[PDB]
Amino acid sequence: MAEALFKQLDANGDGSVSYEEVKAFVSSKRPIKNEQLLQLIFKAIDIDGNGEIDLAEFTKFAAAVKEQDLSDEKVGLKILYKLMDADGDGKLTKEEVTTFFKKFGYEKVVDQIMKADANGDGYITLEEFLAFNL
Ligand SMILES: [Ca+2]
Ligand SMILES: [Ca+2]
After folding, report:
1. How far apart are the C-alpha atoms of 78 and 35, rounded to whole Å?
2. List of residues 6+ apart from 13 with CB closer than 8 A
3. Ligand having the closest approach to the CA of 46
4. For 119, how many CA atoms within 13 A lie in the half-sphere containing its CB?
5. Which ligand minimizes its atom distance to the CA of 113?
6. Taking a C-beta distance cutoff of 8 angstroms, is the pair 10, 17 a contact?
7. What keywords are annotated for this sequence in UniProt (predicted)?
8. How many CB atoms lie within 10 A of CB 25?
Protein backbone atom coordinates (compact mmCIF):
# COMPACT_ATOMS: atom_id res chain seq x y z
CA MET A 1 0.00 0.00 0.00
CA ALA A 2 2.26 2.74 -1.32
CA GLU A 3 3.52 4.44 -4.45
CA ALA A 4 6.38 6.57 -5.71
CA LEU A 5 6.79 6.95 -9.46
CA PHE A 6 5.79 9.83 -11.69
CA LYS A 7 5.07 7.09 -14.21
CA GLN A 8 1.44 6.85 -13.19
CA LEU A 9 1.21 10.54 -12.40
CA ASP A 10 2.07 11.03 -16.06
CA ALA A 11 0.65 7.87 -17.59
CA ASN A 12 0.98 9.60 -20.94
CA GLY A 13 4.15 7.53 -21.07
CA ASP A 14 5.65 10.36 -23.09
CA GLY A 15 8.49 10.42 -20.59
CA SER A 16 8.77 14.18 -20.99
CA VAL A 17 6.31 16.73 -19.65
CA SER A 18 5.93 19.93 -17.67
CA TYR A 19 7.62 19.19 -14.37
CA GLU A 20 5.18 21.79 -13.11
CA GLU A 21 2.69 18.95 -12.89
CA VAL A 22 5.22 16.86 -11.01
CA LYS A 23 6.16 19.84 -8.86
CA ALA A 24 2.58 20.07 -7.64
CA PHE A 25 2.05 16.33 -7.53
CA VAL A 26 4.97 16.07 -5.13
CA SER A 27 4.14 19.35 -3.44
CA SER A 28 0.96 17.59 -2.39
CA LYS A 29 2.90 14.90 -0.56
CA ARG A 30 5.83 15.59 1.73
CA PRO A 31 6.46 19.25 0.88
CA ILE A 32 3.86 21.97 0.42
CA LYS A 33 5.63 25.14 -0.68
CA ASN A 34 8.46 25.12 -3.18
CA GLU A 35 6.79 23.93 -6.36
CA GLN A 36 7.05 27.58 -7.34
CA LEU A 37 10.73 28.31 -6.84
CA LEU A 38 11.47 24.87 -8.23
CA GLN A 39 9.06 24.92 -11.14
CA LEU A 40 10.51 28.34 -11.90
CA ILE A 41 14.18 27.42 -11.76
CA PHE A 42 13.29 24.26 -13.64
CA LYS A 43 11.32 26.08 -16.32
CA ALA A 44 14.48 28.11 -16.81
CA ILE A 45 16.63 25.04 -16.28
CA ASP A 46 14.89 23.72 -19.37
CA ILE A 47 14.23 26.28 -22.08
CA ASP A 48 15.70 23.53 -24.22
CA GLY A 49 13.10 24.57 -26.76
CA ASN A 50 9.79 23.97 -25.02
CA GLY A 51 9.66 23.83 -21.24
CA GLU A 52 8.59 20.24 -20.68
CA ILE A 53 11.24 18.15 -18.96
CA ASP A 54 11.36 14.42 -18.32
CA LEU A 55 11.80 12.73 -14.96
CA ALA A 56 14.91 11.40 -16.66
CA GLU A 57 16.41 14.81 -17.31
CA PHE A 58 15.86 15.51 -13.63
CA THR A 59 17.16 12.20 -12.35
CA LYS A 60 20.08 12.16 -14.76
CA PHE A 61 20.90 15.71 -13.71
CA ALA A 62 20.84 14.59 -10.09
CA ALA A 63 23.18 11.73 -10.88
CA ALA A 64 25.18 14.19 -12.93
CA VAL A 65 25.56 16.56 -10.00
CA LYS A 66 26.16 13.65 -7.66
CA GLU A 67 29.41 12.94 -9.47
CA GLN A 68 32.38 14.41 -7.64
CA ASP A 69 34.38 15.59 -10.63
CA LEU A 70 32.52 18.20 -12.65
CA SER A 71 30.42 20.53 -10.53
CA ASP A 72 33.29 21.37 -8.22
CA GLU A 73 35.26 22.58 -11.21
CA LYS A 74 32.44 25.05 -11.74
CA VAL A 75 31.76 25.53 -8.04
CA GLY A 76 35.07 27.37 -8.07
CA LEU A 77 34.09 29.94 -10.67
CA LYS A 78 30.79 29.99 -8.83
CA ILE A 79 32.10 30.72 -5.35
CA LEU A 80 34.14 33.38 -7.10
CA TYR A 81 31.08 34.70 -8.89
CA LYS A 82 29.44 35.21 -5.52
CA LEU A 83 32.56 36.55 -3.84
CA MET A 84 33.86 38.77 -6.62
CA ASP A 85 30.32 40.11 -6.54
CA ALA A 86 31.02 43.06 -4.27
CA ASP A 87 28.89 45.56 -6.17
CA GLY A 88 26.36 43.13 -7.59
CA ASP A 89 25.32 42.01 -4.13
CA GLY A 90 23.90 38.94 -5.83
CA LYS A 91 23.49 39.96 -9.45
CA LEU A 92 26.36 40.80 -11.77
CA THR A 93 25.69 43.72 -14.08
CA LYS A 94 26.75 43.61 -17.71
CA GLU A 95 29.95 45.56 -17.13
CA GLU A 96 30.48 43.51 -13.99
CA VAL A 97 29.97 40.16 -15.67
CA THR A 98 31.50 41.14 -18.99
CA THR A 99 34.63 42.03 -17.04
CA PHE A 100 34.30 39.17 -14.57
CA PHE A 101 33.41 36.41 -16.99
CA LYS A 102 36.05 37.88 -19.26
CA LYS A 103 38.61 38.02 -16.48
CA PHE A 104 37.72 34.39 -15.89
CA GLY A 105 37.98 33.40 -19.54
CA TYR A 106 34.57 34.00 -21.08
CA GLU A 107 35.08 36.81 -23.55
CA LYS A 108 33.22 34.95 -26.27
CA VAL A 109 30.42 34.65 -23.73
CA VAL A 110 30.19 38.40 -23.30
CA ASP A 111 28.25 38.14 -26.54
CA GLN A 112 25.78 35.56 -25.29
CA ILE A 113 25.85 37.36 -21.96
CA MET A 114 24.74 40.69 -23.38
CA LYS A 115 22.31 38.83 -25.60
CA ALA A 116 21.36 36.61 -22.69
CA ASP A 117 19.82 39.27 -20.47
CA ALA A 118 17.39 41.81 -21.89
CA ASN A 119 14.10 41.44 -20.05
CA GLY A 120 14.35 43.77 -17.08
CA ASP A 121 17.59 43.07 -15.26
CA GLY A 122 20.40 44.03 -17.61
CA TYR A 123 22.56 41.84 -15.40
CA ILE A 124 23.43 38.21 -14.81
CA THR A 125 23.22 36.33 -11.53
CA LEU A 126 25.13 33.25 -10.43
CA GLU A 127 22.34 31.07 -11.75
CA GLU A 128 22.17 32.89 -15.06
CA PHE A 129 25.84 32.30 -15.78
CA LEU A 130 25.50 28.71 -14.64
CA ALA A 131 22.39 28.63 -16.79
CA PHE A 132 24.41 29.39 -19.91
CA ASN A 133 26.44 26.31 -19.10
CA LEU A 134 24.14 23.98 -17.20
CA1 LIG B 1 13.52 19.41 -22.38
CA1 LIG C 1 18.40 38.77 -16.40
Report:
1. 25
2. 7
3. 1
4. 5
5. 2
6. yes
7. Calcium, Lipoprotein, Metal-binding, Myristate, Repeat
8. 15
Q: Tell me how far the alpha carbon of residue 118 lies from the centroid of ligand 2, in angstroms.
A: 6
User: In this structure, are residues 68 and 49 in contact, taking their beta carbons and an 8 Å threshold?
Assistant: no
Domain 69-134 has CATH 3.30.450.40: no
Q: What is the DSSP string of 28-47?
A: TTS--S-HHHHHHHHHHHH-
* Dist. CA 41 → ligand 2 center (Å): 13
CA of 120 to the centre of ligand 2 (A): 6
Domain boundaries, the chain: 1-68, 69-134
Q: Do domains 1-68 and 69-134 have the same CATH topology?
A: yes
CB atoms closer than 10 angstroms to residue 49: 6
Q: Which ligand neighbours the alpha carbon of 118 most closely? A: 2
Alpha carbon of 132 to ligand 1 centroid (Å)? 15
Q: How many angstroms separate the CA atoms of 40 and 13, rounded?
A: 24
